[PDB]
Curated annotation (Swiss-Prot):
It is found in: Secreted, Extracellular space. Its cofactor is Ca(2+). GO terms for cellular component: extracellular space. The active site is at residues 40, 84, 177. It is an enzyme of class 3 (hydrolase). It comes from the Eukaryota. The keyword Hydrolase applies. Its EC number is 3.4.21.4. Binds 1 Ca(2+) ion per subunit. This is Trypsin.
Length: 223
C-alpha cells in the first residue's frame, strides 16, 4: 500500500497473509474454512496466516493453517488477468474471535463513488522495495467504468473495476495482490493489477467480486 496508514492492530480481522516461505499475497476470510484471493497468486503449497498484524514478529494471536485445496477460476487468463480469483480451503477451520472474523460477500455491485477500505502488506514505495511489517490501510473510491477504461484502453473487462485516485499518490502495490477491497461491510474487490503503483492516471485494477458470488457459493458447497 502506497500512501496509506498503519491499520490499528487487528482492526481488519478478515485479512490474511499467504505465505510460501515469505509473505507473497493477501486474501480475505469469507467463512471459517475458506479464503478468497487472486488466481495470479497461485502456488502449489500455501500457508494461510490469520490474526496477523506484524508479520515479522510472533505476537500470540496468529493462526497458521495450511491450504488443503486451491481452486482457481476455470476461466482465469494469465495474460489479461481476466477472472483473477481463487479459493483456498483451509486444512482445519479457523477459530473465530475478536482478531479473526469473516467478511460478507456482496449483495449488489458497488456504485462509482463508493468509499472502500483496501489493506495489505505490499510495497509502500512505488518503485522501491520497502515491504512493511505492519498491516497498511487505504481509503479509496470506486471509479466509473469510463474513467477506468480511459486509463487502461483495451485492457478492462466486465470483471474488473478501478478503485483509487487519478491524480496518483495512493494505491495498492506488489505484495497486496489477492487482498480485500471492502465497501460498506462487503467484499467488492480483490487486489489484481495496475501499471506501476500510485502513478498518475493509472489507478489500481481489482477483480469485480460481485460477478462471482454464485461461483464462490457453488464451489464451497461442492468441496
Ligand atoms: O512477484 C513478482 C510479480 O508478481 C506480482 C503479481 O504478478 O505481484 C505478486 O508478487 C508479490 C510478491 O511480493 C505478491 O505479494 C503480490 O501478491 C503478487 O501479486 C507482480 O505485481 C510482480 O511484478
Ligand atoms: O503489471 C500490470 C501492468 O501490466 C500491463 C501490461 O503492460 O497490463 C497487462 O498485464 C497485467 C498483468 O498484471 C494484466 O492484468 C493486464 O490485463 C494487461 O494489460 C499494464 O497495462 C499494467 O499496468
Ligand atoms: Ca505476527
Amino acid at each position: 500500500i502506497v500512501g496509506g496508514y498503519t491499520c490499528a492492530a487487528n482492526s481488519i480481522p478478515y485479512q490474511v497473509s499467504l505465505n510460501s516461505g515469505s509473505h507473497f499475497c493477501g486474501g480475505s476470510l469469507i467463512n471459517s474454512q475458506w479464503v478468497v484471493s487472486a488466481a495470479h497468486c497461485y502456488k502449489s503449497r500455501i500457508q494461510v496466516r490469520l490474526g496477523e498484524h506484524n508479520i515479522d514478529v510472533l505476537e500470540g494471536n496468529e493462526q497458521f493453517i495450511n491450504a488443503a485445496k486451491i481452486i482457481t477460476h476455470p476461466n482465469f487468463n494469465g495474460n489479461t488477468l481476466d477472472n483473477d480469483i481463487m479459493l483456498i480451503k483451509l486444512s482445519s477451520p479457523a477459530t473465530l474471535n475478536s482478531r479473526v472474523a469473516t467478511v460478507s460477500l456482496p449483495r449488489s455491485c458497488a456504485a462509482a463513488g463508493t468509499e472502500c477500505l483496501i489493506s495489505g502488506w505490499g510495497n509502500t514505495k512505488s518503485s522501491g522495495s520497502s515491504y512493511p511489517s505492519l498491516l497498511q490501510c487505504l481509503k479509496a473510491p470506486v471509479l466509473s467504468d469510463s474513467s477506468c477504461k480511459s486509463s487502461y484502453p483495451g485492457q478492462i473487462t466486465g470483471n474488473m473495476i478501478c478503485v483509487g485516485f487519478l491524480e496518483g499518490g495512493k494505491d495498492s502495490c506488489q505484495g497486496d495482490s489477492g487482498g480485500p477491497v471492502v465497501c460498506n461491510g462487503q467484499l467488492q474487490g480483490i487486489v489484481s493489477w495496475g501499471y506501476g503503483c500510485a502513478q498518475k492516471n493509472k489507478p489500481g485494477v481489482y477483480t469485480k467480486v460481485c460477478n462471482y458470488v454464485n461461483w464462490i457459493q457453488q464451489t464451497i458447497a461442492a468441496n
